[PDB]
Amino acid sequence: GKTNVIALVLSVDEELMGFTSQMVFGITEVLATTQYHLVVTPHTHAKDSMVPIRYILETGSADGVIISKIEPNDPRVRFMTERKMPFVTHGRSDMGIEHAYHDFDNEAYAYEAVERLAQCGRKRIAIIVPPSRFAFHDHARKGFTRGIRDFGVSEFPLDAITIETPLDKIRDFGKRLMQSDDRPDGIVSISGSSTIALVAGFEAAGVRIGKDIDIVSKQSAEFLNWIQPQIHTVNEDIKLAGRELAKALLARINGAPPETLQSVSRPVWSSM
Amino acid sequence: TNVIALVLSVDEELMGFTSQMVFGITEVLATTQYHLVVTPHTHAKDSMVPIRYILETGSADGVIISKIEPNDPRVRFMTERKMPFVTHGRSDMGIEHAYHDFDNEAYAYEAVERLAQCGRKRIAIIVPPSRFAFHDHARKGFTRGIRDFGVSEFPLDAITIETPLDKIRDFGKRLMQSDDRPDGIVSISGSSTIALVAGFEAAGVRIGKDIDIVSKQSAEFLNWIQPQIHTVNEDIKLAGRELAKALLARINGAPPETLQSVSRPVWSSMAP
Numbered sequence: 001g002k003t004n005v006i007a008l009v010l011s012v013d014e015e016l017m018g019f020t021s022q023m024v025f026g027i028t029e030v031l032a033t034t035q036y037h038l039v040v041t042p043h044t045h046a047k048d049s050m051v052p053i054r055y056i057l058e059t060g061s062a063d064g065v066i067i068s069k070i071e072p073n074d075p076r077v078r079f080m081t082e083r084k085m086p087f088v089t090h091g092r093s094d095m096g097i098e099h100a101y102h103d104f105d106n107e108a109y110a111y112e113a114v115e116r117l118a119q120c121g122r123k124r125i126a127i128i129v130p131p132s133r134f135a136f137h138d139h140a141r142k143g144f145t146r147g148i149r150d151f152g153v154s155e156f157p158l159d160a161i162t163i164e165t166p167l168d169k170i171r172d173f174g175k176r177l178m179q180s181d182d183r184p185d186g187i188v189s190i191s192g193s194s195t196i197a198l199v200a201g202f203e204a205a206g207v208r209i210g211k212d213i214d215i216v217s218k219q220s221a222e223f224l225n226w227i228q229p230q231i232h233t234v235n236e237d238i239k240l241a242g243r244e245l246a247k248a249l250l251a252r253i254n255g256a257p258p259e260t261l262q263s264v265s266r267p268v269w270s271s272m
Numbered sequence: 273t274n275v276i277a278l279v280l281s282v283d284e285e286l287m288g289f290t291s292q293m294v295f296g297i298t299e300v301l302a303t304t305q306y307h308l309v310v311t312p313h314t315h316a317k318d319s320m321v322p323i324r325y326i327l328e329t330g331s332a333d334g335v336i337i338s339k340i341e342p343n344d345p346r347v348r349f350m351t352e353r354k355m356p357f358v359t360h361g362r363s364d365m366g367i368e369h370a371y372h373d374f375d376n377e378a379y380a381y382e383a384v385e386r387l388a389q390c391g392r393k394r395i396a397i398i399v400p401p402s403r404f405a406f407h408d409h410a411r412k413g414f415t416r417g418i419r420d421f422g423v424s425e426f427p428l429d430a431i432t433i434e435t436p437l438d439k440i441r442d443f444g445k446r447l448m449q450s451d452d453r454p455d456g457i458v459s460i461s462g463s464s465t466i467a468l469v470a471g472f473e474a475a476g477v478r479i480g481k482d483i484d485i486v487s488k489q490s491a492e493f494l495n496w497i498q499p500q501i502h503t504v505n506e507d508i509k510l511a512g513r514e515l516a517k518a519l520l521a522r523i524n525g526a527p528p529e530t531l532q533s534v535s536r537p538v539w540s541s542m543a544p
């Protein structure tokens with residue numbers, strides 16, 4: 001029956017600059033006007049992704065679940081739909097299931113990122129994307145590919161690293177990249193964490209941000225510009241996301257239809 | 273109850289890496305039947321609110337708190353009411369309770385030493401609000417250090433580590449535009465440091481030549497951006513682990529005098 005618990009299920013493997021607690025606080029700020037408690041339930045990696053979900057349903061430990069790192073064909077989404085556990089996703093699946101969700105428009109972000117580099121005079125653009133299994137990788141990759149076409153620029157190919165690749169190695173990669181004779185003039189990053197490491201490596205090779213190369217990056221809080229005011233920054237509002245995920249879940253638990261409980265936040269360029 | 277309540281002020285720093293603390297806790301709780309509820313509160317005027325509410329409701333078997341004052345009402349209240357708890361920080365009021373803390377005194381002392389070693393003569397420090405015990409630890413270590421290393425303090429009282437970053441930056445710029453400048457800085461916050469450096473740089477000041485900076489950080493981040501910052505690591509994930517172990521043992525009867533630890537300043541490998 002009523003547990004008055006919202007389970008937040010988070011992978012322990014997150015980024016340096018995930019500002020995860022801002023997400024936690026957005027959820028909890030909404031839940032404070034209610035009788036709901038927020039339980040944080042970690043899982044370590046991919047091999048145990050379904051473990052906490054099965055465990056919530058087996059013990060009946062939560063009235064609703066928040067999940068993230070959504071795949072287009074997500075077994076968690078399907079399992080909780082079938083088992084009638086109210087849930088909301090941070091991200092979007094694409095499997096013909098209408099569920100509550102909130103996501104950032106990574107497609108629009110990568111498209112507008114290419115445009116901006118093109119406006120900066122840039123002609124050869126690389127992008128650093130998530131692992132391909134997550135839906136937001138396909139959103140980003142799509143927005144970027146569409147952008148390289150619409151803005152009459154070309155892609156500098158990049159397969160080496162990803163958004164989840166070790167920072168020390170992003171840094172080394174960035175250093176060797178700007179010591180190559182073949183190098184790009186623009187970078188789209190889908191992680192503020194990857195961007196930090198990338199810039200460190202760039203500077204280590206005599207490269208000046210804004211001069212020799214332009215960078216567009218997302219960030220989940222306002223940090224990159226104290227650090228490097230020349231980075232073209234886009235804010236992803238992680239606290240807002242936490243608020244919206246909570247809003248949606250509460251309404252789903254009370255029987256509002258999932259179709260009305262869906263939002264997508266748009267990229268906003270940092271005032272910084 | 274099977275619930276550990278993590279009581280957290282929503283007012284945290286940008287670079288708090290709070291989730292790293294959360295994950296240290298859950299990593300330990302995973303071998304147990306305990307669930308971690310995250311319980312926020314907004315400010316100081318409601319600090320005791322979640323504490324009274326946990327005990328009125330009986331909604332937890334143990335509590336984790338932080339932002340510890342030397343004469344902390346929460347600590348006294350929970351001691352009196354026999355609610356197992358552990359503090360991230362230390363009180364100083366004749367009550368022996370489980371705790372884990374970081375040695376802020378030793379950090380500020382070793383900070384001043386390092387700056388002295390770099391040939392610096394006039395050292396400023398940015399400390400927390402006076403009400404919290406770690407402020408007194410830091411201010412003490414700094415005070416001893418200025419004496420022991422034959423240098424002088426540059427007086428500062430305009431800001432704290434809880435003062436807004438934009439205002440820290442503006443303060444850092446005007447500070448270097450003055451004819452009275454410190455040549456060394458001790459920071460008790462990775463967040464303030466970031467804003468601080470941005471302000472210095474906007475005044476044409478170079479980190480490592482014109483001024484040296486020692487800063488704590490709760491994860492390895494300061495050196496990617498600014499390699500010349502003398503970084504000390506506070507291990508927040510270890511903190512989370514220790515808080516959890518201590519609380520578990522305290523819940524099962526262990527004497528509090530035996531559940532106390534302080535981690536020491538560790539100089540970051542990415543530091544000069």
Ligand SMILES: OC[C@H]1O[C@@](CO)(O[C@H]2O[C@H](CO)[C@@H](O)[C@H](O)[C@H]2O)[C@@H](O)[C@@H]1O
Binds near residue numbers: 070191
């Ligand atoms: O858990 C991933 C989840 O979030 C989104 C939103 O863009 O992808 C993000 O992953 C992290 C979640 O906070 C952040 O670093 C940033 O929001 C973004 O990379 C979803 O698309 C995805 O399901």
Ligand SMILES: OC[C@H]1O[C@@](CO)(O[C@H]2O[C@H](CO)[C@@H](O)[C@H](O)[C@H]2O)[C@@H](O)[C@@H]1O
Binds near residue numbers: 338339340406506
């Ligand atoms: O939460 C306050 C609590 O932590 C200590 C540990 O040094 O002070 C810290 O406050 C935050 C804890 O994560 C961080 O900003 C930073 O690690 C430090 O300033 C305790 O002394 C205090 O009670």
